[PDB]
Design a protein around this ligand. Sequence first.
Ligand SMILES: [Cl-]
Ligand SMILES: [Mn+2]
Ligand SMILES: [Mn+2]
Ligand SMILES: [Mn+2]
Ligand code: NA
Ligand code: NA
Length: 314
Amino acid sequence: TLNGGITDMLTELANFEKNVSQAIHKYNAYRKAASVIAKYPHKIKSGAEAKKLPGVGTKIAEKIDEFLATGKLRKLEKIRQDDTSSSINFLTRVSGIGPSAARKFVDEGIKTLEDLRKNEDKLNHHQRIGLKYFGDFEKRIPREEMLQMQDIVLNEVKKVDSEYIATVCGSFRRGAESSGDMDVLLTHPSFTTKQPKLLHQVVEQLQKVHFITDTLSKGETKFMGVCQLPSEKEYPHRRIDIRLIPKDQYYCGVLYFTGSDIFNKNMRAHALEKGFTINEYTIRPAGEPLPVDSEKDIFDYIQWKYREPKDRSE
DNA sequence: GTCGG
DNA sequence: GCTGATGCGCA
DNA sequence: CCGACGGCGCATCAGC
Ligand SMILES: [Cl-]
Ligand SMILES: [Mn+2]
Ligand SMILES: [Mn+2]
Ligand SMILES: [Mn+2]
Ligand code: NA
Ligand code: NA
């Protein structure tokens, strides 16, 4: 991490803009800077050097000069010094507590995990769960364990129906050594009329075998919940998302959820060059959805040699 | 906050 | 009771 | 100087 000091400062600034200031555009601006600096192959010696980078402007360059010179930033020092900011920032670490709920709680005098634990009544189902598994949800997931989770998900899916396709995407599919969570895409030849229970079947099964232990949200296309490898020292509970998408939106969905949100941004960047527009559902000339029967295909559009998953962090 | 308009 | 309004998390 | 900057599935609940 050639410039981790700087990207950490920028990311703590972004979090503050999102969580306290509720300025989502600044939050994004700061994350854009952090990413262009994290991808930069030199050790930055000055703000003027960073300023060459797109996403890095006047203000950020100046903060960079201060950090490189002092090793700190007075603004972040001040922020972290304030009770309200620091408390609002912290509470958003609970899944289900956003900037609005965090700010409501703090104003009520509820500012800590203890306070939360001492006010179950003012928490909704999702927030109770994020609290219950606060530490767990902050832990990384070793690849060895992801491979084991993947096993259970593919197998139980098969047991419901021999046609379902399940693919684990996100950091996992990129070959990453650890994951923040598990992201599962699901398709089935019958869904491209409609039918209920298509996702519900898979969810119910995984519950039956005690893999999925908690539900955060659930509808006919998206499941958000908690899961755990069977057991010795219990394994930590983990976040899992499952998405049911139309079989004809498969590769666009897989490509998009594979991860490297960065990679996404710039494959989007080069999309509108040969005049294309790609989202998670389709690639369009906008026009009607161009035929997609591979990840290479989507590339074929904007020229562009096929990147394999484990290469697309960039 | 940054960048194109 | 209802539902329009809003919050939340997520590549 | 100034406006654009991603959208959506699902859950909750203030104000009828
Ligand atoms: Cl903003
Ligand atoms: Mn207290
Ligand atoms: Mn993930
Ligand atoms: Mn995810
Ligand atoms: Na710049
Ligand atoms: Na949160």
